[PDB]
Amino acid sequence: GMTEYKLVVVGACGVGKSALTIQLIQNHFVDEYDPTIEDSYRKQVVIDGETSLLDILDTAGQEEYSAMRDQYMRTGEGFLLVFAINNTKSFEDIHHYREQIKRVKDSEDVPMVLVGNKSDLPSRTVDTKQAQDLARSYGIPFIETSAKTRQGVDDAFYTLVREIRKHK
Ligand SMILES: *CCC(=O)N1CCN2c3ncnc4cc(-c5c(C)ccc6n[nH]cc56)c(Cl)c(c34)OC[C@@H]2C1
Ligand SMILES: Nc1nc2c(ncn2[C@@H]2O[C@H](COP(=O)(O)OP(=O)(O)O)[C@@H](O)[C@H]2O)c(=O)[nH]1
Ligand SMILES: [Ca+2]
Ligand SMILES: [Mg+2]
């Protein structure tokens, strides 16, 4: 019947992964979401006139390697790489998330999107141009998002879907 996409949302602790995913699915902003909850969220959506199913895995757990986490990641068709623009270490870590995904996919061209989250915060420490240059060198799109104001949430997930469709 209707297509399903496995989206995986990766990024450092407290970048807004669950806030983004919950805003897309449930249309509200979470203030203090339980940071151990790793669950899968679904939504029916119309993208370029195609009704589709989003299965969104919102990563949590521990900073540790597991055979079981390789398996969940290998099921993923595309990945949002999320940093907050007020945390330069969250952006320093994007490199390791891309490396870890290349290892399990044993692929250079995995549908990915770079997300600079918390675009509403005054206190920016990571500059758009640097984020842009990183996405241009990975060959992936870049979207600035605020889970609070909902700016760029839709277009971040939809751009990932459109990256997975271009992939075959
Ligand atoms: C506050 C908790 C939270 O949101 N976290 C902390 C734990 N991680 C995390 N931290 C470090 N390394 C990680 C590595 C992977 C991973 C990847 C990308 C591919 C294959 C893997 N095999 N074992 C682990 C991994 C992931 Cl998915 C995470 C992670 O998930 C994010 C999460 C963020
Ligand atoms: N101001 C602002 N706060 C955010 C945004 N996204 C998440 N937060 C807050 O940042 C903290 C971490 O968010 P969370 O979604 O739990 O991070 P996760 O560890 O990636 O799941 C929370 O207290 C959120 O309310 C955002 O876009 N703007
Ligand atoms: Ca453990
Ligand atoms: Mg979380």
Side-chain angles (χ1 to χ4, degrees), residues 73-113:
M73 292 303 105
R74 181 173 301 112
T75 73
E77 304 177 81
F79 310 77
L80 291 178
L81 311 165
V82 188
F83 72 98
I85 63 155
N86 70 336
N87 189 291
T88 71
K89 179 154 171 288
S90 80
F91 182 85
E92 277 183 36
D93 287 343
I94 291 296
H95 185 66
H96 294 116
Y97 286 109
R98 179 174 168 257
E99 285 310 305
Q100 282 329 290
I101 293 165
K102 316 258 231 46
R103 168 181 66 74
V104 301
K105 308 251 68 176
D106 180 27
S107 185
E108 221 199 3
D109 60 77
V110 184
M112 289 182 177
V113 169

Side-chain angles (χ1 to χ4, degrees), residues 11-20 29-35 58-59 117-121 145-149:
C13 250
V15 293
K17 299 173 305 280
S18 300
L20 281 165
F29 178 55
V30 191
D31 254 15
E32 320 271 357
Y33 202 73
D34 187 329
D58 171 38
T59 56
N117 182 45
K118 307 198 183 162
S119 79
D120 58 290
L121 292 179
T145 65
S146 169
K148 188 179 192 223
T149 66

